Amino acid sequence: MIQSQINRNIRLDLADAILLSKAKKDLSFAEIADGTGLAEAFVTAALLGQQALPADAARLVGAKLDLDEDSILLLQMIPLRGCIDDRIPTDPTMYRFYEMLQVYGTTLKALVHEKFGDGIIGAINFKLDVKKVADPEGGERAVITLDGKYLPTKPF
Amino acid sequence: MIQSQINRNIRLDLADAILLSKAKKDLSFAEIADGTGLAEAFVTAALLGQQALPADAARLVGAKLDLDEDSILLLQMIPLRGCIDDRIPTDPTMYRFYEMLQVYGTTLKALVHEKFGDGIIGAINFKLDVKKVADPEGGERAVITLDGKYLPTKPF
Amino acid sequence: MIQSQINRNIRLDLADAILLSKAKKDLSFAEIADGTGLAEAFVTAALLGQQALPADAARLVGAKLDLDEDSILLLQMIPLRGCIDDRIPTDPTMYRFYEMLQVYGTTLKALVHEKFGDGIIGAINFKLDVKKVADPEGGERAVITLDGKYLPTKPF
Amino acid sequence: MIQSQINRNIRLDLADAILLSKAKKDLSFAEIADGTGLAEAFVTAALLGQQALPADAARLVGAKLDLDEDSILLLQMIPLRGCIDDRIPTDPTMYRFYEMLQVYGTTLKALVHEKFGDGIIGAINFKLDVKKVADPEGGERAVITLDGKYLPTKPF
Amino acid sequence: MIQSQINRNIRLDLADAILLSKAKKDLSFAEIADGTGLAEAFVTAALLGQQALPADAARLVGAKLDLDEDSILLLQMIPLRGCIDDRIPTDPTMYRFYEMLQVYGTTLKALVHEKFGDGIIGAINFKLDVKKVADPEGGERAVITLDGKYLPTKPF
Amino acid sequence: MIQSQINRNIRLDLADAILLSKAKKDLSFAEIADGTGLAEAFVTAALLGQQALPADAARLVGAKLDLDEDSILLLQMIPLRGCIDDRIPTDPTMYRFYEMLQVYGTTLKALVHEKFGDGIIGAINFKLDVKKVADPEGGERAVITLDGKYLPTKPF
Amino acid sequence: MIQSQINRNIRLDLADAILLSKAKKDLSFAEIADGTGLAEAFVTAALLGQQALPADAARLVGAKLDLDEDSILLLQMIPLRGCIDDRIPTDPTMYRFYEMLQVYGTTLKALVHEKFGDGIIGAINFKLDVKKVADPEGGERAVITLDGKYLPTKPF
Amino acid sequence: MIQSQINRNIRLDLADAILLSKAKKDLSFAEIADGTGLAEAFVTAALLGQQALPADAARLVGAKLDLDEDSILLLQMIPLRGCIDDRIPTDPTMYRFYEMLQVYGTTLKALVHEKFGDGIIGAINFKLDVKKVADPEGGERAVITLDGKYLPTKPF
Amino acid sequence: MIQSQINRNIRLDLADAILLSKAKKDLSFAEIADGTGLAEAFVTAALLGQQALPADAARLVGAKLDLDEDSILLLQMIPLRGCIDDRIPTDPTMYRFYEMLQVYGTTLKALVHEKFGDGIIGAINFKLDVKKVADPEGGERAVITLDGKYLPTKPF
Amino acid sequence: MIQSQINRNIRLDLADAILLSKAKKDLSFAEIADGTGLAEAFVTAALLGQQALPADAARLVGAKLDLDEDSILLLQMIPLRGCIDDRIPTDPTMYRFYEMLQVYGTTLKALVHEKFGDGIIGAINFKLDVKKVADPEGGERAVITLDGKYLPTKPF
Ligand SMILES: [Br-]
Ligand SMILES: [Br-]
Ligand SMILES: [Br-]
Ligand SMILES: [Br-]
Ligand SMILES: [Br-]
Ligand SMILES: [Br-]
Ligand SMILES: [Br-]
Ligand SMILES: [Br-]
Ligand SMILES: [Br-]
Ligand SMILES: [Br-]
């Protein structure tokens, strides 16, 4: 039977334990997700308290990280989602994504309405991924693709 | 000589005026940006107070919208950036992008550090585009590409 | 061509003007919506800056309220939605709905996940109505129906 | 003698404990509330710290969940209500109901005053229920019914 | 037909105009409410944007303060209530009432549950009054009386 | 020697302990305050962390509640007052008193100034009581008496 | 008849006007207060929107600053007090006084309770003043004296 | 070697331990400071986490209060200063000081500039004392002396 | 006689007028500060409302910018300082300086206490300059110098 | 394999532990950093939770401070950066740097755009140092140098 959380702290405390075990074992997120059938972004978000793992995946990652039974069960719960401590991120790496919204938020809205119409680009029927692409001018670029379904707003 | 702003309301007031003109003329953002040499996301962001237009572009769009001269000069000024009224958007269309950050923010962090290293994906050496495509399962999707240069943090 | 707003104050200012006009004419929202072929709750939300009217409806209600042309055009723009002045309502009528969330929010989460699964009940593919029902103990009840589509969150 | 709480964390810490027990026994909210004589939404809300159970219901659910006597006692206390961590929910599921308020709050006020008069629709003399309904176009809809007593505001 | 406001600033601006006239005419709130049939506290709350006056009171106070027709009409609208500028009062006189809540809020909760049971003391079915008394140790006391109906919360 | 507190959580934690003990003994606040020579609202506020008890009363309530010596000592300390978690109450019961201030705060200011003059109605030279009263219409009312000394602001 | 304000902005705007006129006339606060019979701190506070002037003083200072009739009347109104824009001052000169509270607020509480008892040092029956005193180690010192009446909190 | 703190909670927790020991020993702040060669406000502020004690003073108050070595060492650390829990005090005793800034903040700014010049009255080169004295009209007053060095801002 | 402001918007509105004038004349800040005898950062800060100009400098920059007499007078007033709209900048260019504080603020505190002692590095007895240098890896760097006097905190 | 944190409190608790060990051993940050090959500001920042140490450095500092293996591992993790407890520092030493931004932030923006162009001075490609320089008028000056790379914003 499906089970859900209401206090994000239970899963976020579990995330810190996971990250410690991960480091002690010198593991990567790619390796933790490999063999699971699930995308690296999905498995990683689950570890970090933002998604639920199916049971088989919870056991698979529990074994890799030496987690206890309560922990494997907790990973299967539907989380109380929200990873930002206090609305605005303090961390530079996360903050950049917030700043992209401060710069282009209204442009995303205007261009969505133009291309699709009234409504939203969904954050539920959605996936994201991060690809590394060499920069012609030197160094590396990240192309983050946000991929979401258009949900129209219509009169009733 | 480059000229900059310190109070966002001046450019945001101009954005409202530009939108009224645009609606009166029943123009699209794609049409406004056409012939400009610049990406629709870039030019649109300028209209909306978040970027500076080169004089040539400003003149072009200023013609299209019948702007007065103070308006065409204002569009060339470097803006006081920040399109969100009070930190967290209230508009559902803009909110979904904020929600991506609440669900995937710590995952983006974790995976940027894994794929690139310590540091950030930049929001200045950065490009944005929005594509409408059909969803294989039915209806329409947005593919939004956040294209940013990796900037490492290294000891000193 | 579709047109959108980015500053809520343009449509909220129009809303106050509409409200004065309406009062002077001693009209109801029921009567304003009459003949539009659109629900009272939809047309009302439009006048109040939270939905866009199609041109024909905009011209009908403009007629009823003696709106000028710029106003009628504005009513057709996709709004920058968000009707609450500063996140938490101060008005008792509005506040009671916020208190429903403070009391039942986690219960709505839990029971949604139990009945439907992981994901959300949407606010976009969504309809709302308000019905007055006699209370059998004496007085009147409001039955407010929130009718939203289930959007699953599945692994990928 | 009736007993009441003043710090929400006691009962929210209990709710976390309850949820772990529930997960361990693979129970549903529907099963927990069976035999109680009380609505699923009311019993769930009590488990989650937002309502008080009568003593018989408290003993029933305590038995189902293997709760100690202090926990069974606590469930009977009148709580310090407020389930949202920090005013605006982070969780998408909970957030959609907040967004309904940001889009429709003022329409709700408008239409309540039109249909009933000055005053409020109550959140205390109040019932709430969640029903799953097939969507004609495919998939599932939630019909959430808010049912509140009208309390008029009159001159004195 | 009943008319309602959604933006408090329309009535609060009217309030300021009312106060200026009141000052210019050297009137008291006592005098302004004379002849209306309505308590001082209720009429005052109206002038200040927190209650609606019946048509006949609106005309009476309007004539006293030399208000235009639009202002007299506005006073009859059901307000968007909330007098405090930004949640916590800065003014010492108002602040004392908020401090009473900071000292006695939990005590009021506890004693309300003890005496009446689960639920609330209402702010709708409610009145207040301010009375002056001599202090037997010198000077004067205000006895502010809050009189609200008990509304029970019961299981369903 | 008088002793005082600087972190409210010490006394608030004590209050939760008191409330568990009270509930276990099925005690009322009225019965706890009996024999102290002090008003119900005063003793209750002390238990809840918002007043100091004299030694004798501290010993007496501690006897009835089975409190340890450190706890009886804590009840005699002058508290760091402020019972509200985060400025605005979440709990419906407490919230209604905040809403009274949102609806009537400026009226209270206005009528205080008219009846008494410039200055404040004190919250320190102050007493509070809660009286349950038959409602002639059926049901019950709370008459909450706020009895405060007027403190004038005079030029200097 | 006493008259009071409810929106600080009316008197704060007037304060800006007064400061412009003062500057054009190259006047000091010392000379504006001279002749009124009122302390410089009181008269200054009044000009700045935080006290009311009696009629004769309002007329005197109005003559000195060439204020119009409505401005002279506004100065006699009991203000909606609160001079800080948004709770925490930005201005360094004002901020130092807030920092004194952040460093010594709890020490002030502790020592007031030790020296006087439970209760407060009042801010109504209160005067303050700023004296320049040569610093024996070179430079100048401000001695700011805060002088307030002790109001005891006693059991009832 | 000088040592310093970055998280206020270490020293604030230590403050609560100190206050319990002080209450248990029935000590005053006056007598704890006796023999340190240091002012009662300075030593008190140290105990409360807002200043650093020299080693000799730390040992002396340490022996009076029976503190362990880690505690005595912590007292010598340069603190992460800021005694207010969440910017605005809730405690009435501390609040009055904040209210003095809300009423007289801009007056203090204006008079400091007039009497001293452009700059600040510092909170670092600064001393504070609290005196109890009779009020000529009856009762008791506090004379709180804020004694700080004027620091000019000069052009560069 | 020295003159001061209490509402930042008077000088910020003047700043926006200055910047429109400066842009029409295609002036640089370096040119405007030329011949004033004052550092470009000092004069610029003054134009932007954060410092006061001496009378001769005010006249000079006012000649260059074609400012009227009231505007020239306003530049000589001691400002209500505070350039950040709402505590945390939204503009990326300004935000980066805030991020330096989020990353290095506690390091700064630690290294100041180690190198100088307990106290502060002043922001009043202070100068600032921005220098453009070549980046030896290619591109350009800013060397921004914060030059402030150490002010110790010593026991008393 | 790189390892990253998501909750700042893990590393901040570590910092408090480090600080106590450091105090006990009477060590300086200068000397902790010695032997490390990394700048005092960088190493100090790492100890305080704002930078990651390479493995050799982590072992070296870990041996000086008597840290356990888990702590030495945690120091190697990429941090969730943000040292300020709640956006605006309370500590006077840290606050001065915030105040510098309140006084000079718009000047920094203005001059950066003038000298370099549209874009930012970076806080990732960035170093800082603190130098003591005797004030020739007496005492000591801290010269804090901020050195960041210019990142242009260009059209695309
Ligand atoms: Br969605
Ligand atoms: Br960047
Ligand atoms: Br949705
Ligand atoms: Br209600
Ligand atoms: Br109510
Ligand atoms: Br008081
Ligand atoms: Br007071
Ligand atoms: Br200072
Ligand atoms: Br300073
Ligand atoms: Br950067």
Swiss-Prot record, chains A, B, C, D, E, F, G, H, I, J:
GO terms for biological process: cyanate catabolic process. It comes from the Bacteria. Gene3D superfamilies: Cyanate lyase, C-terminal domain, lambda repressor-like DNA-binding domains. Keywords: Lyase. One of its GO terms (molecular function) is DNA binding. The active site is at R96, E99, G122. It catalyses: cyanate + hydrogencarbonate + 3 H(+) = NH4(+) + 2 CO2. Belongs to the cyanase family. HAMAP family: Cyanate_hydrat (MF_00535). Catalyzes the reaction of cyanate with bicarbonate to produce ammonia and carbon dioxide. This is Cyanate hydratase. The gene is cynS.
